[PDB]
Amino acid sequence: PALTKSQTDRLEVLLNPKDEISLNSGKPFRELESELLSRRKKDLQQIYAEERENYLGKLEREITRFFVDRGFLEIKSPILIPLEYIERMGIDNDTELSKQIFRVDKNFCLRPMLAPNLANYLRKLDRALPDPIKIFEIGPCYRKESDGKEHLEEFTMLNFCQMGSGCTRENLESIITDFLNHLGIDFKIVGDSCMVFGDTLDVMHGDLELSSAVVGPIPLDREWGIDKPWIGAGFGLERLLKVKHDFKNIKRAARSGSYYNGISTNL
Amino acid sequence: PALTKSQTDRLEVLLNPKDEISLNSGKPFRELESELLSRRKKDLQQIYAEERENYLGKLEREITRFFVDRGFLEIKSPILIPLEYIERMGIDNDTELSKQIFRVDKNFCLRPMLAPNLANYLRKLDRALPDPIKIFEIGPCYRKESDGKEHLEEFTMLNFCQMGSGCTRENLESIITDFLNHLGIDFKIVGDSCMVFGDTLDVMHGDLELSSAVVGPIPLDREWGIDKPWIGAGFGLERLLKVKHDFKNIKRAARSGSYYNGISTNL
Ligand SMILES: Nc1ncnc2c1ncn2[C@@H]1O[C@H](COP(=O)(O)OP(=O)(O)OP(=O)(O)O)[C@@H](O)[C@H]1O
Ligand SMILES: Nc1ncnc2c1ncn2[C@@H]1O[C@H](COP(=O)(O)OP(=O)(O)OP(=O)(O)O)[C@@H](O)[C@H]1O
Ligand SMILES: N[C@@H](C[Se]CCNC(=O)OCc1ccccc1)C(=O)O
Ligand SMILES: N[C@@H](C[Se]CCNC(=O)OCc1ccccc1)C(=O)O
Ligand SMILES: [Mg+2]
Ligand SMILES: [Mg+2]
Ligand SMILES: [Mg+2]
Ligand SMILES: [Mg+2]
Ligand SMILES: [Mg+2]
Ligand SMILES: [Mg+2]
C-alpha cells in the first residue's frame, strides 16, 4: 500500500495533531480515510452539541477581556484605510512591505497593520483622557504573502499600546509576559529591526514570531502628531492559535470555509 | 448670534442625542462649543474609567452569546472572497448591487454580504452534523453607497440561518422576534423583494430597514449545492446601534477614528 500524493494530501487534511495515526503505517488509504472521517465528524458533532464557539472569535473575546480589565480602551477602527497612511508610515513605494499591500479603488487599501489607526487614536484621546492613554484593537489585517506554514493573506492582529507615563521597555515586557502567561504560551524576547519602527523586540515561540513590539519615541512620531513616550506590540491571533493547538499549518486557524476550529469541513 | 455652517457642523459633531441643547438658542458659538466639549470629555473619561468596551465589539459579543446559546454555530469566514461568488449569487454585472462591489486585485472583492460563505458552510456541515444545521456569522461587509444617514461603505453584518427541519416562515419570524426582543428594539415585518433572493421579509423600525430575511428553497440553491429547506436573515449592527442610541447619523456607530461610542474624538 503506497499512497499517492493526492491520497496523502487528503489524509493530511483530515489528520489532527492529537491523532496518533501515521499515514505510512501500511494500512490502505480507504481505512485511514474512513477512520479519520469518523473522528472528524465526531469532533465536529461534539463542538456543535457542547461549545459552538469559533476559535478566532473566542480568542478575540478572551483577549478583549484581558485588556479591558487592565485598563485599555477597546478600539474598532476602519479596515479599509487611505493609501496615504502607508506612505506616512514610512513604507516607501519600492520597499518590501509596500509590495504586500492590497489596493482598493484608487486611494485606499486594506490595512496591513493596526498601528496607523491606533496612532491617530492615541493622539486624539490624549486631548481628553488622563495619562496614561492605554488602547488596543483586534481585527483583520491583510498582506500579500508567499504563503508558507506561518503566513496568511488575511489574518487577525492584536495591537495594544500606551502613551504617556509608564512607557518603558520593562513595562512593555511586563505586559507581554502577563499576556502570554494568561494564554499559557512560553516565549522569549529577541532583538530585531524593521523599516517602519527601527529596532523591535520580537516575541518568539521557538522560531515562530508571535509579535513585534516597539518602545518609542521614534522620529516617525512627528508625522502622526505623537509627541510623548509610547510602547506598543502587534500579535497575530492565528499564530497564537497555531501554538495553542499544535497546528502544522496556520491555515487551520484562519478565516476559512475549509476548516472549522482546525477540523476539515470537507467530510 | 448667527452661526455659520462650519460652526453649526462643529456643534452637531459634539452634540449627543441625550443633550437638551439647541444650537439656535441664541447663545454664541464659543459658549455652546465649550459646554459641549466639556460634556463630551466627561463622557469619554467615564467610559475610560468604568467601561472601556466599544459599542460595535460589545454588540457583536452580545449577539454571539444569544445565537450560541440557542444552538447556532459561530462562523468566521473570509472577508476577501472570489469575485466569482458575486456572479454565482445571481448578481449580474450590470445590476445595481454589482456596481456597489469593492474589487480587490483581479478575481477577488470585499464581501458585500455574508450569504455566499454561509451557504457553503450549510452545504458542508450538512454532511457531518445532525438536522437542523444552525449557523451564524458577524463581521465586516462592504458596499459602495451614496452615503446617507443610514448607509456606510464599511458596515457589520449579522446573518443567522438554518437548513433542514424547522425552516418555516413562522420559525424565522419567531427567531427575529426573540432576537429583537432581547435587544429591546420594536419592529414590524413588511414584504419586499430583491434580486438575489426574490421575495424578502423586511424587518423595519419605522422607515429604517434593520434586516432582509428569506424563506427558502429558491431556484438559486442549486448553484450553491443547497437542496433542503432553509431560512436566514441579515442584519446591520450599525443600524441596530443607531436605533438603540438614537443617533441621527449612522456614522456615529461605525468603525471610525472620528467617533468613539458616538462621542466625537476631536476634542
Ligand atoms: N501574513 C501574516 N499572517 C499571519 N500573521 C502575521 C502575518 N504578518 C504578520 N503577522 C503577525 O503580526 C505580527 C506583527 O506584524 P509584523 O509586521 O511584526 O510581522 P512580520 O515581522 O512581517 O512577521 P514575519 O517576519 O513572520 O513576516 C507578527 O509578529 C505576526 O504574529
Ligand atoms: N451600506 C450599508 N450600511 C449599513 N448597513 C447596511 C448597508 N447595506 C445593508 N445594510 C444592512 O444589512 C442588512 C441586509 O442587507 P440587504 O442587502 O438587505 O440591504 P439593503 O436591502 O440593500 O438595505 P437598503 O435597502 O437600506 O440599502 C440590511 O437590512 C441593513 O441592516
Ligand atoms: N509592531 C507592529 C505595530 Se506596533 C505600533 C503601536 N501602535 C501605536 O500606537 O504607535 C504609535 C505610533 C505609531 C507610528 C508612528 C508614531 C506613533 C507592526 O509592525 O505591525
Ligand atoms: N438577506 C441577506 C442575506 Se440572507 C441568506 C442566508 N444565508 C444562507 O445560508 O442562505 C443559503 C443560500 C444562499 C444562497 C443561495 C442558496 C442558499 C442579504 O440580502 O444580504
Ligand atoms: Mg512579514
Ligand atoms: Mg518578522
Ligand atoms: Mg515583526
Ligand atoms: Mg442597499
Ligand atoms: Mg432594502
Ligand atoms: Mg434588504
Q: Which domains does chain B have, with CATH numbers?
A: 1-52 (1.10.287.540), 53-267 (3.30.930.10)
Return d(Cα A27, Cα A24) in angstroms, integer: 7
Return d(Cα B265, Cα B7) in angstroms, integer: 17
**Cell numbers for B256:** 471610525
Look up residue A44 and give its amino acid: L
Tell me, what DSSP letter sits at residue A38?
H
Resolution in A: 1.5
CA-angle at A61, arms to A257 and B162, nearest 5°: 40
Q: Cβ A256–B77 below 8 Å, yes or no?
A: yes
Residue of A nearest to B142 (CA): A80
Residues 6+ apart with CB under 8 A from B178: B70
Q: Please give the full DSSP string across B202-254, using - where no structure is assigned.
A: EEEETTEEEEEEEES--GGGGGGT--S-EEEEEEEHHHHHHHHHT-SSGGGGS
Per-window interface: B 174-203 vs A, CB < 8 A: none
CA-angle at A94, arms to A92 and A96, nearest 5°: 90
Mutate-to-test residue for ligand 2 from B118, B209, B242, highest number of ligand atoms within 8 A of CB = B209
**Cell numbers for A212:** 513585534
B204 beta partners: B188, B209
A171 Cβ under 8 Å from any chain B Cβ? no
Return d(Cα A236, Cα A141) in angstroms, integer: 9
**Cell numbers for A82:** 487611505
Return d(Cα B129, Cα B146) in angstroms, integer: 42
Helix locations, B70-114, DSSP H: 84-88, 96-99
Query: Which atom of ligand 1 is the closest one to the Cα of A153?
Result: 1
CA of A208 to the centre of ligand 6 (A): 9
**Residue A86, min C-alpha distance to chain B (Å):** 16
Considering every ligand atom shown, identify the ligand nearest to the alpha carbon of residue B196 and give its number.
4
- Ligand 3, atom 16: nearest CA belongs to which residue? A221
Mutation for testing the B interface, residue in A37, A54, A122, A237 having most B CBs under 10 Å:
A54
Nearest to A15 by CA among A250, A252, A240: A252
Return d(Cα B257, Cα A120) in angstroms, integer: 7
Ligand 4 within 6 A of CB of B214:
yes
Q: Is the peptide bond before B132 cis (omega within 30 degrees of 0)?
A: yes
